Design an enzyme around this catalytic site. Sequence first.
Site, PDB file in Angstrom:
ATOM      1  N   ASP A 158       0.822  -1.194   0.000  1.00  0.00           N
ATOM      2  CA  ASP A 158       0.000   0.000   0.000  1.00  0.00           C
ATOM      3  C   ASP A 158       0.876   1.272   0.000  1.00  0.00           C
ATOM      4  O   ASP A 158       0.361   2.385  -0.062  1.00  0.00           O
ATOM      5  CB  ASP A 158      -1.001  -0.020   1.167  1.00  0.00           C
ATOM      6  CG  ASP A 158      -0.345   0.130   2.527  1.00  0.00           C
ATOM      7  OD1 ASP A 158       0.816  -0.276   2.691  1.00  0.00           O
ATOM      8  OD2 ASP A 158      -1.003   0.650   3.450  1.00  0.00           O
ATOM      9  N   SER A 199       3.040   2.190   2.482  1.00  0.00           N
ATOM     10  CA  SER A 199       3.524   2.575   3.796  1.00  0.00           C
ATOM     11  C   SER A 199       4.778   1.733   4.077  1.00  0.00           C
ATOM     12  O   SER A 199       5.099   0.806   3.313  1.00  0.00           O
ATOM     13  CB  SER A 199       2.453   2.355   4.858  1.00  0.00           C
ATOM     14  OG  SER A 199       2.152   0.988   4.940  1.00  0.00           O
TER      15      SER A 199
END
Length: 129
Positions: free
Chosen positions: A48, A50
């Site tokens: 994602d 992160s």
Amino acid sequence: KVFGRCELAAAMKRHGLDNYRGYSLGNWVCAAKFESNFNTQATNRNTDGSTDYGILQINSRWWCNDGRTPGSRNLCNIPCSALLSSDITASVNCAKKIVSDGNGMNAWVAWRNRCKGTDVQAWIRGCRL
């Protein structure tokens, strides 16, 4: 810094993680092992976008600010690089906030899949804390 098992355990007990929220010390050492390999500088990027930081692999979308994770809530109010330090204080303090948010240590996928329901005691056996 790459800690030793007993050395990390002692550091965590001194930081009050020992049975913090019901989780005996062995849970935390077991998690650190499979999350970062006892390495304070460990970083791992997620699909994602992160990134997880430090000994306890704290996530940038929620807990710290790394300057590249859009929508980072930065709940622990601290720069993610602060978590790569040889001093685990900031990691430990932020971890106490995560573990207290309702989900317990399930927040750590490795604890969930490799430590939960195992003889966690074995991780601090033989340690002079």
